[PDB]
Amino acid sequence: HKILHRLLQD
Amino acid sequence: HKILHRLLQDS
Amino acid sequence: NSLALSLTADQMVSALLDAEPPILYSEYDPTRPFSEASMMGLLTNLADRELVHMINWAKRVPGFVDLTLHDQVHLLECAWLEILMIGLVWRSMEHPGKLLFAPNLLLDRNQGKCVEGMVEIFDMLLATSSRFRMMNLQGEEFVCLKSIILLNSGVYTFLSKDHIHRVLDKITDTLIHLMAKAGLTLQQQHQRLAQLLLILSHIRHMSNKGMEHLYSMKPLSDLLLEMLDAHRLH
Amino acid sequence: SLALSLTADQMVSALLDAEPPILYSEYDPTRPFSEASMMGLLTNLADRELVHMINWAKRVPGFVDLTLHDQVHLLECAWLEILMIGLVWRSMEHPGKLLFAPNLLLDRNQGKCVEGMVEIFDMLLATSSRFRMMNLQGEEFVCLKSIILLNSGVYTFLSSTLKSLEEKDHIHRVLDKITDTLIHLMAKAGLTLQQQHQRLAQLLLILSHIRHMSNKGMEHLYSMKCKLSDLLLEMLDAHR
């Protein structure tokens, strides 16, 4: 779980 | 003088 | 499959210009004399906020959205400091001897001495900015170079790539199109292309030296910490 | 400077004739591979290659026109890059292997013999895979290698005087000549104008990865001296 994942789709 | 300096200067 | 390859040269330029991130401000703290921690705190906070716009800017780079989620994470993780640096170098271009971190934070090499090992990277950043100024780098060329850094910095670490290379060729065609439209001869077109791309090696070098100090130095946010933690292969 | 007066074909012939030989290592296949033995083989080989690299650099057009202080700086900054692209070049026809010497051909499973070296092995293999796909030519390799020597330390000069900036300016004129040489080779190989700039860009973008591989290699060489040869000890000391 990385903040980069949530940033790239939200 | 460093080693690279002498080898470059070698002639 | 990818719409980016169907774009014309002008459609590529205008899409990259429109996607540019905003120029952010630093804290308006009037304590102009910076300590070692206050110097680091302003830069860290500015970088932490610039990253959010960078991730947004990355998704608007043509063809970037066509990559898988793992491929996008990898490219941003490997290139994020390079992208910040070329942005810093670009907006510092009209301020010789100065680094324009923000419109309210313009530094010279003397102010970089507050943190150890930073004045050496300031001098490299200033030398890149001066080199861009002597080449009269145009904004249309800047956005092509910044996109190249994004797609090229981690494309050779995909192992456990063909679509990226086609997009890279597209951006190359766009750069040549900008130089021919500016009146450069055929020989001047490929010489300028080579010169701009050779500078990307120095930017890579500056990013590596900077990372080397950054993960030895370690309040940064968790996003910035996970971007820095990704370069801890040493 | 006679470098700026050379034609494209004369540039290639000059660089091809200046190519250093392919050295051999003292690898005894019967000795069990150990972390200390493999690092020693690579160090001994790199130290002997540096002697050839120093004499090769003097034969690169325009290099000897520079001041001796400038020559020292460029080699100190680029020596590991030049070893790495040479390693990558002679490993093209050996997929998944790194040809350190004709008698020392290694895979990634043997790079795990040293901690942190396997990650750089993967990057070298990935770069060698790219030269294979592009079908890189020898005339292009010697151009890329000369570009590295002139470009890696060109923006790290002190250049305290205005006449010291002229030394930077002369390097740029030679680099433009090498760019003219690369394009000459590609137009003569039957490539169209669009294909020429695309390949020229693909070739120079790999140099960014080669700089990245060098910086990471140098970083681990800082800690490996804490745990050789005098020339290599001073080359590495220039990066600390």
Cβ distance D6 to D175 under 8 Å?
no
Q: How far apart are CA D24 and CA B3, in angstroms?
A: 23
| Burial class of residue C56, CB neighbours in 10 A (0-12, 13-18, 19+) | middle
Q: Does A6 touch chain C (CB under 8 A)?
A: no
Q: How far is D178 from chain B (nearest CA, A)?
A: 23
- The one-letter amino acid at C31: T
Helix (H, G, I), strand (E, B) or coil at C167: helix
Resolution in A: 2.4
Cite the annotated binding site of C for 17beta-estradiol by residue number: 50, 91, 213
Q: Chain C within 8 Å of D151 (Cβ-Cβ)? A: yes
Q: Which of D45, D44, D53, D99 is nearest to D78 (CA)?
A: D53
Give chain A positions within 8 Å (CB) of C226: 2-4
d(CA D106, CA D3): 38
What span, in angstroms and rounded, lies between the C-alpha atoms of D58 and D53? Answer: 9
* Selected residue of D179, D203, D221, D222 to mutate for chain C interface (largest C Cβ count, 10 A): D179
Q: Hey, are the CB atoms on D180 and C191 less than 8 Å from each other?
A: yes
Q: What angle do CA D69, D75, D77 make, to 5 degrees?
A: 100
**Helix extents (H) in chain D:** 8-17, 35-58, 68-89, 108-111, 117-134, 138-151, 162-188, 193-226, 230-237
**C80 is written with which tokens?**
């994020």
- Contact between residue C214 and residue C159 where contact means Cβ atoms under 8 Å apart: no
Q: Please, are residues C12 and C62 in contact by the beta-carbon 8 Å criterion?
A: yes
CA dist list (Å): C139 to C63, C146, C178, C188, D192: 21, 11, 11, 19, 28
Whole-number Å distance between alpha carbons of D189 and D30: 46
Place of tokens 């990385």: A2
Residue D101's φ and ψ, nearest 5 degrees, are: -155, 160
Q: Which of D68, D69, D233 to mutate to test the interface with B (most CBs of B within 10 A)?
A: D68
A7/C227 CB distance under 8 A: no
Packing angle between helix C162-181 and helix C186-217, nearest 10 degrees? 130
- The nearest CA of chain D is from the CA of B10 a distance in Å of 10
**DSSP, res D97:** -
Q: Which residues of B touch D57 (CB under 8 A)?
A: 8
Instruction: List the subunits that have 3+ CB pairs under 8 angstroms with A.
Output: C
Question: What six digits make up the tokens of D128?
Answer: 């060698």
If 0-12 CB within 10 Å is exposed, 13-18 middle and 19+ buried, where does residue D203 land?
Answer: buried
Preceding-residue numbers of gaps in chain B (C–N over 2.5 Å): none
CB count within 10 Å of CB C69 equals 11
Residue type, C204: R
Known binding residues of C: 50, 91, 213
Reduce the DSSP state of residue C30 to 3 states and report it.
Answer: coil
CB pairs under 8 A between B and D: 26
Cβ pair D178, D146 in contact under 8 A: yes
- The phi and psi torsions of D104 (rounded to 5 degrees) equal -135, 90
The DSSP secondary-structure symbol of C20 reads P
Report d(CA C166, CA D175) in Å as an integer.
27
Per CB-CB distance under 8 Å, the chain C contacts of A9 are 69
For C100, the 3-state DSSP assignment is strand
Cα–Cα distance measured from residue C127 to residue C133, given in angstroms and rounded to the nearest whole number:
10
The residues pairing with D105 across neighbouring beta strands, listed in sequence order, are D99
Q: How far apart are alpha carbons C226 and A4 in whole angstroms?
A: 8
Under 8 Å between Cβ of D88 and D76: no
Which long-range contacts link D189-192 to residues 24+ away (Cβ below 8 Å)?
D189/D137
Could you tell me which of C40, C17, C150, C9 has the C-alpha nearest to residue C84? C150
**D–A contact (≥3 CB pairs within 8 Å)?**
no
D 29-88 residues with CB below 8 A of C?
Answer: none
**D190-198 long-range contacts, CB within 8 A, separation 24+:** D193/C186, D194/C173, D196/C190, D197/C172, D197/C173, D197/C176, D197/C189, D197/C190, D197/C193, D198/C169, D198/C172, D198/C173
**Mutate which of C153, C190, C234 to test chain D, going by most D C-beta atoms within 10 A?**
C190
- Chain A residue closest to C226 (CA)? A2
Alpha-carbon gap, residue C178 to A9, rounded angstroms: 33
Domains of chain D as residue ranges with CATH:
1-240 (1.10.565.10)
Quick check: D97 contacting C, CB < 8 Å?
no
Q: Which residue has the tokens 């090229």?
A: C152
How distant is the alpha carbon of residue D48 from its chain centre? 15
> DSSP secondary structure string, D102-134?
TTEEE-HHHHTTSTTHHHHHHHHHHHHHHHHHH
Residues of B in contact with D71 (CB under 8 A): 8
Inspect the interface and report whether the beta carbons of A8 and C59 lie closer than 8 Å.
Answer: yes
C-alpha–C-alpha distance, residues D63 and D170, integer Å: 10
The 8-class DSSP code of residue C212 comes to H
CB distance A4–C55 less than 8 Å? yes
Cβ-based contacts under 8 A for chains C and D:
100
Type of residue at D27: Y
Residues that constitute the known binding site of D: 49, 90, 220
CA-wise closest residue to D12 among D141, D150, D153, D128: D141
List residues forming the annotated binding site of D for 17beta-estradiol: 49, 90, 220
Q: First vs last Cα of chain C: how many Å apart?
A: 38
